[PDB]
Each structure stands twice: as structure tokens, then as C-alpha cells.
Amino acid sequence: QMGCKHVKGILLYGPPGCGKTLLARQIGKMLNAREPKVVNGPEILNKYVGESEANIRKLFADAEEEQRRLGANSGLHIIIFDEIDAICKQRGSMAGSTGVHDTVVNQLLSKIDGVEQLNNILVIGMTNRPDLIDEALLRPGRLEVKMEIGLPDEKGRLQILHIHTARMRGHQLLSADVDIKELAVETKNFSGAELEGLVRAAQSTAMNRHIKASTKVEVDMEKAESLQVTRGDFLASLENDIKPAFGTNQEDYASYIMNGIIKWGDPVTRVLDDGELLVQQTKNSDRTPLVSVLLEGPPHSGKTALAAKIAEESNFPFIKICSPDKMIGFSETAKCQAMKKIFDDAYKSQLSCVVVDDIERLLDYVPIGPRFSNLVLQALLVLLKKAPPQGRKLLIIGTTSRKDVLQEMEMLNAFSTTIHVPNIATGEQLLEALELLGNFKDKERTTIAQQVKGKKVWIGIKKLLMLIEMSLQMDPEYRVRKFLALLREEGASP
Amino acid sequence: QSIINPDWNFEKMGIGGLDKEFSDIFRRAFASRVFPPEIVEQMGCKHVKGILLYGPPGCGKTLLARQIGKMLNAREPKVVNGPEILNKYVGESEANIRKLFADAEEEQRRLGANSGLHIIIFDEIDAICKQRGSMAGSTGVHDTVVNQLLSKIDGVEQLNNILVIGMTNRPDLIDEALLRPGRLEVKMEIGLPDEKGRLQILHIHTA
Amino acid sequence: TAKCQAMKKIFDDAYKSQLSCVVVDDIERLLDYVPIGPRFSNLVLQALLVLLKKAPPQGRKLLIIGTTSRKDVLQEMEMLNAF
Amino acid sequence: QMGCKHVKGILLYGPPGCGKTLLARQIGKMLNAREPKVVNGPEILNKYVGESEANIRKLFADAEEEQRRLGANSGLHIIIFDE
Amino acid sequence: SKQALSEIETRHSEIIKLENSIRELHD
Amino acid sequence: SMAEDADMRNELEEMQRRADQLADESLESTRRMLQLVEESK
Ligand SMILES: Nc1ncnc2c1ncn2[C@@H]1O[C@H](COP(=O)(O)OP(=O)(O)OP(=O)(O)O)[C@@H](O)[C@H]1O
Ligand SMILES: Nc1ncnc2c1ncn2[C@@H]1O[C@H](COP(=O)(O)OP(=O)(O)OP(=O)(O)O)[C@@H](O)[C@H]1O
Ligand SMILES: Nc1ncnc2c1ncn2[C@@H]1O[C@H](COP(=O)(O)OP(=O)(O)OP(=O)(O)O)[C@@H](O)[C@H]1O
Ligand SMILES: Nc1ncnc2c1ncn2[C@@H]1O[C@H](COP(=O)(O)OP(=O)(O)OP(=O)(O)O)[C@@H](O)[C@H]1O
Numbered sequence: 001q002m003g004c005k006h007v008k009g010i011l012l013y014g015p016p017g018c019g020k021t022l023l024a025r026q027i028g029k030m031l032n033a034r035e036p037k038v039v040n041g042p043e044i045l046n047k048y049v050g051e052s053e054a055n056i057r058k059l060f061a062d063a064e065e066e067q068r069r070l071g072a073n074s075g076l077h078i079i080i081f082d083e084i085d086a087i088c089k090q091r092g093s094m095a096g097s098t099g100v101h102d103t104v105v106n107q108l109l110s111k112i113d114g115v116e117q118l119n120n121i122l123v124i125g126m127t128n129r130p131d132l133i134d135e136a137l138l139r140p141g142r143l144e145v146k147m148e149i150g151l152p153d154e155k156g157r158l159q160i161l162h163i164h165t166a167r168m169r170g171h172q173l174l175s176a177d178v179d180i181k182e183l184a185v186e187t188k189n190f191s192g193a194e195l196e197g198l199v200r201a202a203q204s205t206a207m208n209r210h211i212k213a214s215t216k217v218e219v220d221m222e223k224a225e226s227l228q229v230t231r232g233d234f235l236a237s238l239e240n241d242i243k244p245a246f247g248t249n250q251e252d253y254a255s256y257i258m259n260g261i262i263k264w265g266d267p268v269t270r271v272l273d274d275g276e277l278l279v280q281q282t283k284n285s286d287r288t289p290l291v292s293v294l295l296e297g298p299p300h301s302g303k304t305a306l307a308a309k310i311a312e313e314s315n316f317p318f319i320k321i322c323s324p325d326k327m328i329g330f331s332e333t334a335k336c337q338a339m340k341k342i343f344d345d346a347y348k349s350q351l352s353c354v355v356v357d358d359i360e361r362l363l364d365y366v367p368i369g370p371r372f373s374n375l376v377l378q379a380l381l382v383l384l385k386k387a388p389p390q391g392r393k394l395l396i397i398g399t400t401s402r403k404d405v406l407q408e409m410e411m412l413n414a415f416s417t418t419i420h421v422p423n424i425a426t427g428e429q430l431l432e433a434l435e436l437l438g439n440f441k442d443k444e445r446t447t448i449a450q451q452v453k454g455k456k457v458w459i460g461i462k463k464l465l466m467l468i469e470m471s472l473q474m475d476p477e478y479r480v481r482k483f484l485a486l487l488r489e490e491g492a493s494p
Numbered sequence: 495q496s497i498i499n500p501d502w503n504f505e506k507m508g509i510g511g512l513d514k515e516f517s518d519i520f521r522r523a524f525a526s527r528v529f530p531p532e533i534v535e536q537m538g539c540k541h542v543k544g545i546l547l548y549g550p551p552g553c554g555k556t557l558l559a560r561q562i563g564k565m566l567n568a569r570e571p572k573v574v575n576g577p578e579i580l581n582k583y584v585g586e587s588e589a590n591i592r593k594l595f596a597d598a599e600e601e602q603r604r605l606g607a608n609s610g611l612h613i614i615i616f617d618e619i620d621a622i623c624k625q626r627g628s629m630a631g632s633t634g635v636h637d638t639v640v641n642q643l644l645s646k647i648d649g650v651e652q653l654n655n656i657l658v659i660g661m662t663n664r665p666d667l668i669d670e671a672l673l674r675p676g677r678l679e680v681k682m683e684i685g686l687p688d689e690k691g692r693l694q695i696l697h698i699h700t701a
Numbered sequence: 702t703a704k705c706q707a708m709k710k711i712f713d714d715a716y717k718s719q720l721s722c723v724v725v726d727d728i729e730r731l732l733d734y735v736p737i738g739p740r741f742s743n744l745v746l747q748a749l750l751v752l753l754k755k756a757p758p759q760g761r762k763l764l765i766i767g768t769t770s771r772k773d774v775l776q777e778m779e780m781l782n783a784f
Numbered sequence: 785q786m787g788c789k790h791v792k793g794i795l796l797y798g799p800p801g802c803g804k805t806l807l808a809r810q811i812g813k814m815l816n817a818r819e820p821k822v823v824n825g826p827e828i829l830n831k832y833v834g835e836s837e838a839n840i841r842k843l844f845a846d847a848e849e850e851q852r853r854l855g856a857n858s859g860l861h862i863i864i865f866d867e
Numbered sequence: 868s869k870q871a872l873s874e875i876e877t878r879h880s881e882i883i884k885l886e887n888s889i890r891e892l893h894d
Numbered sequence: 895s896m897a898e899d900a901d902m903r904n905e906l907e908e909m910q911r912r913a914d915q916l917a918d919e920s921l922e923s924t925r926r927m928l929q930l931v932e933e934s935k
Contacts, residue, residue: 017674025650041645042638045585047907082649086641097634098584098904128671129626171536197675200539208521211529217498224533245674254759299782325755328748329705361750364743366778371743578841580834584904632900634833685717831902872911879920886927893930 006119008112009143013127017193017245018149020126024080027124034062037079042086045100052100053107060111060121067120080124085132092134105134113141151191157184160195168229175228183234189244202237203229249320256308256321264433264461267422268306274419275310282395283314283351290387292396294412297421299401300460304357306421307397311353316395318349323357335362336379347388352395359400377409384414423460427452433461439468444480451484458493497528497611499567507561510698511691512554515682519545519562522680523657527611542679543648544658548665549684555661556617558684562659563613571613577621580635587635588642595646598655609655619660625669640669648677704731705748712752720762725749728769739774746778753783808864817860825867 012020028036037059044055063077091102112118123143127133137143152160161180168174187198210223263269282291295303311319322342327335346352356362359380363372388394398415406412424430430452434440440448467490471483509516526534526541545562547555563571572594579590598612616622626637647658658678662668665681672678687695715721725731732745757763767784775781796804812820821843828839843863850858 016671017676021650038650040649041642042588045588045638047583047585047905049906049908083641083645086638097632099906100584167538173537193675197679200542203537203539204522204525207525207529211525213528214517214520215504217496217500217502217528219529221530224530227533245670255756258756324751328709328751329702329744331702361747364747366743366746368739368741368777576837577834578837580837582832582834582902582905583907631898632903634901634904831899833901833904868909869911872913872916875913875920876916879916879923882920882923882927886923886930889927889930893934 005141007144008119008122008141009125009138009145011125011127011130011133011138011143011146012149013130013147014149015151015191016128017191018151019192020149024082024124024126028078028080031076031078033076033078039079039081041083044087044104045098049100052104056104056107056111060118063118063121064116067118074120076122077120078122078124082126084125085127085129088132088134088137090132090134105137109137109142151189154184154188157187157190157195160192161199164196164199173228175230177231178229178234179231187238189246189248191245194242194245198234198238198242201241202233205237206230206233249318251321253308253312257305261305261309262433262436264424264436265429271306271419271421272310272313275306276313278417279310279314279353279395282393289393290385290396291394292384292398292415293417293419294406294415295397295399295419295421296403297401298423298460300462301421301423302461303399303401303421307355307357307399311355311397314353314395316349316351316353318346318352320346321355321357324362332373332375335373335376339376339379339383343383343386346394347392350391351393353397354395355397355399357399359398360402360405365402365405377411381411381414424457424464427455427457430457430464433464437468439472440480447480448484457487457491459487459491463490497524497567498565502565507565508698509554509557509561510694511687512558512684515684516558519680519682540676541654543653543656543676544678545660545680545682546665546678547659547661547682547684548663550686551663553684553686555684559615559617559659559661563615566611566613568611568613571615573615574617576618579622579639584634587639591639591642592646595653595656598653599651601655602653607654611655611657613657613659616658616660618662620662620664620667623668623672625667644669644671647672702744704745708745708748708752715763716757716761718761722764722766724766724768726768728767729771729774734771734774746780750780750783805866808866812862812864815860815862817862820862820864822864823866 012023014020039059044052046052046055059079066077067074087101088105089096089101091105096102112121112123125133125143138146158180161184165174165180187195190198206227206229210220210227212220261268278291278293295307297303308321311321320342322338327338330338342354346354363376365372384396400406403412412418424433427449431445431449434445434448467483467486471479471486474482504516523542523545526539547558549555574594579587581587581590594614598609601609601612622636623640623643624636626640629636647656660678673681711723715723728749732742732749734741753765769775772781796807798804823843828836830836830839847861850861
């Protein structure tokens with residue numbers, strides 16, 4: 001009564017290890033019809049001329065005969081094409097590589113829907129690169145619907161592990177001290193195959209513990225029957241065995257924060273408080289989808305470490321750090337590309353947070369003349385005011401050690417707020433830092449106190465750490481004297 | 495039937511300074527195939543089917559490959575020397591590659607679960623396997639070869655007696671799709687030994 | 702860029718080992734410098750300043766030594782405060 | 785008894801006109817064995833796919849057959865990859 | 868191929884003799 | 895900047911010799927044999 005045609009095409013594709021084959025095999029199993037036809041990649045190509053299209057005719061031969069035999073009440077046939085990119089390359093560029101492909105693709109084109117209208121076939125395609133698929137074929141009548149598989153999230157992830165661990169639970173092999181939720185929380189950005197890999201990897205080490213061999217290959221058999229995967233297994237496993245196939249958005253935090261944070265006084269607390277205030281503001285506002293804050297402080301004051309802490313405090317889904325460390329030897333244009341790319345990615349997720357550290361070292365600034373890369377400066381200035389797509393937000397935190405220079409280039413006016421990072425000023429705080437670090441004893445803590453109380457002090461935290469490390473290499477009876485001499489020698493500061 | 499030759503001794507294979515790597519590889523690869531099958535049956539796990547080695551020149555990768563091949567109490571391994579599969583005709587490289595897995599498929603079809611072990615050594619795998627969409631200079635056969643190998647190694651059909659070993663000097667140029675779990679999991683990096691390693695190396699050679 | 706890459710290769714190869722020492726001699730001759738002008742290459746200076754503050758992968762140690770014969774010139778470029 | 789393996793490689797280099805080819809030919813003639821093969825630069829290249837590798841492999845076939853057949857009393861073969 | 872067609876002619880060689888024998892029987 | 899050489903595409907096996915008239919001749923003899931054998935009965 002609707003007298004309407006039928007669809008016969010759907011294109012499956014995505015990143016590796018998502019489950020494309022799983023869907024193809026189950027979909028074929030689900031539909032009740034003739035046994036599925038499987039084309040194992042470029043298995044049709046032959047050296048003899050003309051046999052290539054012959055195999056395609058053989059593949060479709062059964063359907064045509066049955067369709068004529070039964071008429072409008074004939075059954076439905078299914079063909080599964082695997083790695084279509086192999087055959088259907090991009091010969092649209094006139095020629096291909098072998099003189100046997102253009103004819104094959106044209107033959108299929110006509111065969112599926114040509115002079116004779118066939119309506120009892122279904123084609124299922126799996127690939128890895130959408131470009132290699134020709135646009136002309138993916139037109140109404142042959143392939144009019146497409147799909148784009150992706151990676152799972154924590155919610156579905158729980159299911160993925162719950163389907164594989166089920167048998168272990170059913171066989172009572174899973175030690176009851178294992179929590180799935182905790183595991184799913186840690187494993188972020190994983191793929192389909194990776195998850196199975198974790199299960200096998202973790203089970204592997206426990207498998208190994210029971211077997212005691214190496215010099216002679218013998219099975220103990222005394223503990224074989226007694227076994228149960230432990231919680232430690234998964235931990236050790238991933239830690240040293242599995243690495244996500246897409247790296248990690250959060251880079252090696254230990255590279256930046258090598259000592260955590262120690263509260264030597266109020267100023268650190270105030271800075272963290274402001275960081276929380278700002279991130280909260282950007283979290284719950286709409287009239288200003290974009291915000292920015294600039295960190296400024298003397299050198300060797302720990303700006304980057306605090307910036308990382310503040311960013312880590314926010315639970316934004318996407319957090320990334322761009323620094324000059326990775327770009328060494330890059331020309332004046334590559335830096336622009338990397339800058340464009342990172343801010344491109346940040347546009348995808350709903351909430352983002354990006355940190356730019358050591359601005360002045362990213363512009364190649366040197367005070368002889370002076371000199372700097374103008375192009376990068378522009379690429380930076382334009383990006384600080386480009387609002388993201390509708391219904392999204394962003395947050396940019398920058399770092400610098402030269403307040404005046406940024407004023408000279410007239411860029412401080414772009415940022416919306418500035419924060420000051422102070423340094424040790426009172427000897428009492430110095431003693432507090434030493435006490436918390438616990439590197440000198442009471443008699444030593446007093447001896448120094450008699451000197452620090454004499455006058456004022458001014459030194460960054462990192463320098464003081466270096467001084468302590470150098471000091472502890474002398475003889476025990478002279479360490480204090482060396483430390484005092486070092487401070488006085490370097491203590492010439494306002 | 496035992497999977498390992500009873501007359502095998504670790505001290506006799508003539509390796510030195512790579513004890514940890516050998517132990518790790520043995521734990522990862524053959525651990526599941528030596529324990530009595532019943533445990534595997536209730537566990538319901540699928541064996542690993544891939545090992546890759548890489549390092550600077552003159553480290554001893556080929557020695558590890560040959561010793562692993564000889565260790566297995568099974569049929570003699572089949573060796574493929576570098577890019578020796580390429581052929582002038584079209585449709586012959588793929589046929590030659592498929593011929594390598596014929597016997598394993600036959601054994602799987604005939605005896606099903608209880609089957610021997612078949613090994614393949616893709617020496618200098620970098621020559622044939624590269625990232626798709628680069629070498630486009632009259633590439634009459636290269637991307638088709640790599641696609642066929644991808645399909646054959648792990649496709650709709652499943653096997654349980656295939657083991658793939660690959661040695662390379664350029665780890666970062668291989669296709670990512672060939673590095674996924676289930677195809678090539680074990681990846682080991684062979685490096686220069688230390689004083690103790692040098693000691694063992696010089697002791698073995700002068701016995 | 703040849704100089705940059707040739708220095709990067711050494712500074713990377715030294716990371717692979719556990720602990721190591723590197724020597725950079727005749728800094729002023731490494732980056733072209735002449736009292737006329739002055740004239741010097743910025744890229745090499747930036748690469749050096751970046752490498753001088755890159756910690757190796759965790760659990761590995763490094764010692765870097767440098768030799769120069771013109772202290773004031775290096776002080777002007779703000780490099781003397783990084784040692 | 786010493787359990788060693790014979791060396792299987794040599795190389796030479798120098799400025800033009802010093803007596804390289806002469807030494808190569810003399811050493812080739814010094815052995816009471818089969819006639820040495822020859823390859824004069826790119827004389828093994830070919831246009832058909834994979835034929836170059838087959839040409840290279842053909843060179844070593846005789847030595848492999850000799851080794852597998854006669855074992856430890858096998859003969860001696862030489863080659864010259866000139867240029 | 869040259870060899871294949873030479874073989875086909877060799878096969879055909881016997882047809883004439885058989886035909887002559889049958890015509891002899893007919894006579 | 896001169897487009898470098900390219901590997902010979904491949905080989906497309908195709909063989910044709912002298913079959914047509916040789917097998918047509920072969921046929922014309924069998925037909926006559928059939929006719930004679932029919933005639934004898
Ligand atoms: N979402 C998923 N849930 C469960 N298992 C999965 C999932 N994705 C992948 N796998 C597992 O990955 C294993 C190997 O990867 P899979 O065959 O799914 O990848 P594919 O990209 O679809 O295949 P191919 O590389 O052949 O095109 C399969 O056995 C399947 O068990
Ligand atoms: N309470 C603290 N606040 C900040 N940094 C701290 C604190 N306690 C210890 N540190 C150490 O301070 C170090 C500062 O790191 P870093 O040198 O990258 O920062 P910076 O001084 O802002 O940078 P720059 O080297 O450009 O001067 C960190 O490695 C951390 O180990
Ligand atoms: N651990 C080792 N113990 C003893 N001998 C070794 C060891 N590693 C290397 N060798 C010696 O090195 C020689 C060459 O080894 P091999 O062919 O494996 O080298 P490779 O560097 O891995 O190969 P390639 O040259 O193809 O990159 C072997 O014959 C062996 O004598
Ligand atoms: N020590 C020597 N005594 C006699 N003749 C010598 C000596 N060294 C070289 N020659 C002469 O070298 C000539 C052959 O040229 P030769 O092979 O030396 O050139 P080459 O060094 O191989 O040049 P190229 O750089 O092109 O390879 C002969 O005429 C031979 O007499």
C-alpha cells in the first residue's frame with residue numbers, strides 16, 4: 001500500500017579494535033536467510049584477463065536464478081564484503097595500478113543495480129578509510145546510509161568487562177576481592193581490543209605464579225586446582241604491560257610536579273583560592289563563554305607547578321598542556337601549526353582547559369635588539385579572543401616571568417585578570433620551610449635561626465632546594481657554615 | 495602430548511644477559527599452552543598470537559628467534575627471508591602468502607581443538623609491511639599484500655596453532671592496525687648489556 | 702637546522718642510558734658571534750636554553766658541563782642565570 | 785677444537801689510482817677453487833617486479849646447495865660487489 | 868601455445884586413420 | 895625534479911596460437927565418420 005522500495009546498503013567503518021567484525025558476524029547470524037557469503041579481501045583478483053568479473057558473476061549468480069524462479073515472493077540474500085578499500089581504491093584518478101580494477105568496479109556497479117532491478121540482496125561493508133570509498137557508488141539505491149563507530153565510555157565499559165568476567169564469575173574463578181567500578185574508573189581512553197587485552201594480561205601473571213619452571217618444564221600440579229585471579233593482578237598488569245593506543249590526554253604529571261605542594265604560608269593558599277574561584281566562574285556562566293587568566297611572578301618561583309595544580313583541580317573532561325619542550329628545532333611556521341591543532345581539538349569537547357607555559361621562551365625573545373617571531377605573536381593574539389562554537393566553553397591559563405615585556409608588546413590588555421606569585425620574604429617562613437622539609441636538626445635549626453633573624457631574606461624555593469642539596473655534600477661538621485656562606489653570597493637581593 | 499622437548503636446557507641455548515626478556519616472553523606467550531587444558535576450558539581464554547622484537551644492530555634478535563623456533567617440540571618452522579614473496583605477476587604474492595597458512599587451516603578443520611603448532615618468521619617485516627597510502631609509484635602489489643596479511647592473520651575465521659614472530663629495526667614505521675591487541679601484543683626491546691651481561695657473553699663464547 | 706638536529710641527536714641518545722655526562726665546549730663558537738653587530742643565530746640559543754632545563758625520564762641522571770671564554774656576552778643574553 | 789667461524793667479509797677504500805682492483809683480482813686468483821663471480825656496479829637491477837631480488841638470490845644458490853649436500857668438506861666460493 | 872597446438876594436431880592425427888578404417892568397413 | 899622510474903605494472907598472461915581452423919578441420923572428419931557409421935546399419 002506504501003509501494004516503496006527497499007534499502008540494501010550500510011557502510012561500517014571506524015578506528016581499529018571497535019567491533020566492526022563483531023557486528024558483521026552477529027548481524028549475519030541474526031537474519032534468517034541463505035548462508036552468508038564471505039569475501040576474504042582481494043581474493044577475486046586473478047592473473048588471467050576477464051576472470052575477475054567472472055567471480056563477481058558467480059557470487060551473484062544464485063540470487064538472479066532464485067529471484068526469477070520465485071518472483072516477488074523470493075527470499076533475501078546477504079553478501080558481506082571485507083576490506084572493500086582493497087578493490088574499490090581511488091581509480092577515479094583515471095588510472096589505477098593494475099589494469100584489472102576499473103572493470104571490476106564498473107561491473108559491480110551495473111550488476112547490483114543496472115538494466116535488471118534486483119531487490120533480494122544486501123551488502124555489508126567494513127573498512128578503515130572513508131576516502132578510499134568512491135562517492136558515486138554510495139548513492140541512493142546501493143548505499144544510502146552510513147555509520148561511524150567509535151570508542152566506548154565508562155558506562156559501556158562496565159558492560160564490556162562484565163561480559164568477559166561473567167564466565168569467571170560463573171565458574172567462581174574470580175576472587176571476590178575485585179571491584180569492577182574502580183577498574184573502569186582508572187581505564188580511560190581505552191578501546192575495545194585493549195579491554196580484552198587487560199583481562200588476558202591480568203590473568204596471565206596469576207597463571208604464571210602457579211607454574212614453577214624455567215630450567216625444567218614441569219607442572220607442579222599441587223596448586224593448579226587452587227587459583228583465583230587477584231586484585232593486585234590487574235594493577236601490576238596494566239602498570240607494566242598495557243599502554244593505551246591513543247597515548248594520554250593527561251601527560252606525565254611527574255615531569256612538572258616533582259615534589260607536590262608544601263604550604264609554607266598564606267600566599268599559596270590565596271593563589272589556590274583564586275584558581276578555584278575562576279574555574280568555578282567559567283563553570284557556571286553563559287554570557288562569557290571564554291575566560292583567561294595570566295600568571296606572573298619572579299623567576300624560580302614555581303609558577304608552572306601551581307598552574308598545573310589549579311588545572312588538575314578542575315574535573316574538566318579534556319585537559320592538555322602545550323609547552324616548547326616538545327618543539328625543538330621547529331621553524332617559525334610549525335609552531336603555528338601545532339598551536340592551531342591543539343586549539344582545534346579543544347573546540348570538540350564541551351568543557352576544556354589549556355595551559356601555555358613559558359610564553360617568552362615560545363616567542364624566541366632575546367633582549368639584544370631585541371628579536372622575536374612576529375608571526376607566532378599574531379597566531380597567539382588572534383586565538384585568545386576566538387569564541388568557541390555555540391553552547392561550549394573554554395579556559396586558558398598562561399605563564400610568564402617578564403611582566404614589562406608583555407606590556408611593551410601591548411598584549412597584557414587581552415587577558416582579563418592577573419595574579420601575583422610572591423616569594424620568601426621573612427626568615428620565619430624560611431625556618432618554617434626547613435622545619436617542614438626536615439633536613440636539619442634542632443641545634444642546627446636554632447644556629448641558623450640566630451642568623452636569619454638578624455636581617456631579611458629573599459630567595460626562590462627552587463634555588464633554596466639546590467642550595468640544600470649542594471650543602472649536604474660537605475662534611476657534617478661544616479654543613480651549616482657552608483649553607484650560611486652560600487646564602488650570603490647569593491643573598492644579595494632587594 | 496608434551497609441548498616442549500624434554501631434552502631442553504636453558505643454559506644450552508647460548509644466550510647471555512637477556513634472562514629477564516626471555517622470562518617475560520615465556521610468561522606472555524607459552525604460559526597458557528603448557529598448563530593442563532581443563533584449567534583453560536573453565537577459564538575460557540584465547541591465546542596470544544604475536545611477538546615483536548626491535549633494537550639497534552648487533553644485539554642478538556635472530557638468535558632469540560632461532561632458539562624460540564628450535565625450542566618448540568613441534569614441526570620444523572617455516573622461514574620467509576625478507577621481501578622474497580613479491581612476484582612479477584598480479585595475484586601471486588597474495589596466493590603465496592595464503593599458502594603459508596594452508597596447513598594450519600587444514601589441521602584445524604580436521605582435528606579441531608587438538609592440533610599441533612605452526613610457526614612463521616617474517617624476517618625483516620619492515621620491507622613488506624608499511625603504512626597504507628605512501629608508496630604509490632606503480633605499486634602493482636604492496637597494499638594488497640598488506641591487506642591480505644591483515645585479513646589472514648585474524649579474520650572471520652579463527653585458529654589456535656598460529657604464532658607470528660617479527661624482527662625490525664624501525665618500530666615506529668609499522669602499521670598501527672597491525673599493532674592492535676590480538677594480532678601483535680608482545681613487544682620487546684633488545685638493548686646493550688651491562689658489565690654482568692658482558693661477563694656472561696664473554697664466558698659463553700669461550701667455554 | 703643541521704646544527705640543531707645534530708645537537709638534538711646527542712642530547713636524546715644520552716637519555717637512553719641510566720646516568721651520563723655531556724660536554725659542550727666553545728659555546729660562543731657554537732652559535733656564531735662577532736663583536737660587529739652583534740650578530741648571532743637565535744635558533745641555536747633557544748634550543749640550548751630549552752635543553753638546559755629538560756629533566757630526563759624519571760630515575761635517570763645527567764651532568765652537563767660547558768666551557769666558554771666570554772662571560773659578559775653570555776650574561777647579556779640572560780643565559781648565565783640558567784647555570 | 786677452537787670452535788670459531790671463518791670471516792666472510794672484506795672492504796677497501798682510498799683515493800683514485802692506488803691499486804684496489806689489482807689487489808681484488810690477485811686475491812681472487814690466489815685461491816685454488818671455482819672461478820670467482822663478478823658484478824660491475826648496478827648490473828643486477830631490473831624493471832619487472834621482484835626480479836632484482838631473485839637475481840641476487842641466484843648468486844648464493846650454489847653455495848647453499850654445496851653446504852647442504854657435502855657439509856664440512858664443502859668447497860669455497862668468492863664474489864665481487866665492485867662499486 | 869605452440870606446444871599445446873602441436874599436441875592438438877598430434878591428437879587429430881589419428882582421426883584420419885579411423886575415418887579410413889570406417890570407410891573401409893562401409894565398403 | 896624528474897619523475898623517477900616506475901616498476902613495470904605487471905604481466906597479463908594471454909596466449910593465442912593456431913586453433914580455429916585446426917579444430918574446424920578436426921571436426922569435419924568426425925562428422926563424416928558419423929555419417930558413414932549411420933549408413934552401414
Ligand atoms: N566493543 C567491543 N566489545 C567487545 N569486544 C570488542 C569490542 N571491540 C572489539 N572487541 C574485540 O576485539 C577483537 C578483535 O577486534 P575486532 O575484530 O572487534 O576489530 P575490527 O576493527 O572490527 O576488525 P578488523 O581489524 O578485522 O576490521 C574481537 O574479537 C572482539 O572480541
Ligand atoms: N609549594 C610549592 N610551590 C611551588 N613549587 C614547589 C613547591 N614545593 C616544591 N616546589 C617545587 O618547585 C618546582 C618549581 O618548578 P619549575 O622550575 O618548573 O617552576 P617555575 O619556578 O615557575 O619555573 P622556571 O624554571 O621558569 O623559573 C617544582 O618542581 C616543585 O618541585
Ligand atoms: N646475547 C648473545 N649471546 C651470544 N651471542 C650473541 C648474543 N647477541 C648477539 N650474539 C652474537 O651476534 C651474532 C649476530 O647476531 P644476530 O644475527 O642476531 O644480530 P642482530 O643485530 O639481531 O641482527 P641484524 O644484523 O639483522 O640487525 C650472533 O651470531 C651471535 O654470535
Ligand atoms: N702497487 C702497484 N703496482 C703496480 N701497478 C699498480 C699498483 N697500484 C696500482 N697499480 C696500477 O693500477 C692500474 C689499475 O687501476 P686501479 O685499479 O689501480 O685504479 P683504481 O684505484 O681502482 O681506480 P678507481 O678509483 O676508479 O676504482 C694498473 O695499471 C696497475 O698497474
